[PDB]
């Protein structure tokens, strides 16, 4: 359906992923697990969801702006394509001098589904 | 608002976003603020700025290339939310060894108002 | 204008970016050239490849999961705008402790292409409620 997307649960701990307000660009992303990120190291925060992209675009595992500015925490990777397999992961980036504890049910990501354009290359010999 | 880009300052040092060329996929945006990103460190660089942008869009904070490849400086966070009215600010990260400075007026990122979609999540069983 | 992604080799060591599936987001992209990424550092990887993309959108140089996971590699900048007519760099960033080796045909990265909006910036004085 061109107006909702499917979303199940791997777990009991998975939550389903919804935006923060009316005119949110995401939807805010959850760990199903209990982790720590290692100062300056990066740790795998798997959500426990099998979301289906829609149609004409990728989901972009994109971070949220507090855990930024006050954890230096960043996401890596992110690029959640329309066949991609199984439960959803975030990547963890912590920059800091500080370890980043993630509980069960934290929000460590926002999920934005990025309208994208997927043509077929054409080689050519000039470009104008 | 609807298909618009609306600008307003919150102070007479911010500077209107502007496309660098007419191919230019993002806008010019410039610290109202001077600071330190410190190296291996990080700096918010408000742009004094409050914006409206188009429906079916959030405003990406991108990086500046020149800045990525000579300066090691990254943005970090960068996606502002269509119904954010709040001052816009740019979540600098500065992963070389030495200081970045950043005079009031001095490029720092870039906006690009990135297409999305906002489908409603709908939980199921299973998928396919 | 142009729905269409050309690209023109700028030497033999380029390679043509291709979506790994059916499914796939990104367009592989290759270095062309060799070089190492310094522990806690940066590099170029040219693609030898000049490039014209889609109308209404422009190339974001997004990161492999791979290498993001396994070898702390992300890239930096990546905004390629729609009159980009040099060659396509890659700038990859290394927050690991060890260096990342790349050899000519590497996949480093993969091309997106972002649908994007270009309005005309307007100043106001007022904007209306959230
Ligand atoms: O780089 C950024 C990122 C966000 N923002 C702004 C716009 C965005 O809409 C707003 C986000 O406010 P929230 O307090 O809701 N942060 P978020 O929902 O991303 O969660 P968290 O507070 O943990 O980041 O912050 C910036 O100015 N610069
Ligand atoms: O990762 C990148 C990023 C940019 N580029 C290219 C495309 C882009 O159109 C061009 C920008 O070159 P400049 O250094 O002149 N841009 P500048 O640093 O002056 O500002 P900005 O990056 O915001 O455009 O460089 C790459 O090849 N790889
Ligand atoms: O976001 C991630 C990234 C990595 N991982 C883990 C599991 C996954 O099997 C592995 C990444 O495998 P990819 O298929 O995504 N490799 P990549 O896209 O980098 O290269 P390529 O598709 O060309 O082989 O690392 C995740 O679970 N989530
Ligand atoms: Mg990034
Ligand atoms: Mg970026
Ligand atoms: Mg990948
Ligand atoms: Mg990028
Ligand atoms: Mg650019």
Known sequence: ????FKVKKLSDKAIIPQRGSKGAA????????????????????????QI???????????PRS???????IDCGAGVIDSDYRGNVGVVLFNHSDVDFKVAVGDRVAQLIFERIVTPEPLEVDEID
């Open 52 to 62: 289906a992209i829609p149609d004409g675009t990728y989901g972009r595992i994109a």
């Open 26 to 49: 995401g939807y805010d992303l959850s760990s199903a697990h209990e982790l720590v990120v290692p100062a300056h190291g990066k740790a795998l925060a798997m959500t426990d969801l």
């Open 1 to 4: 359906g061109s107006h909702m």
């Open 66 to 72: 507090g855990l930024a500015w006050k954890n230096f």
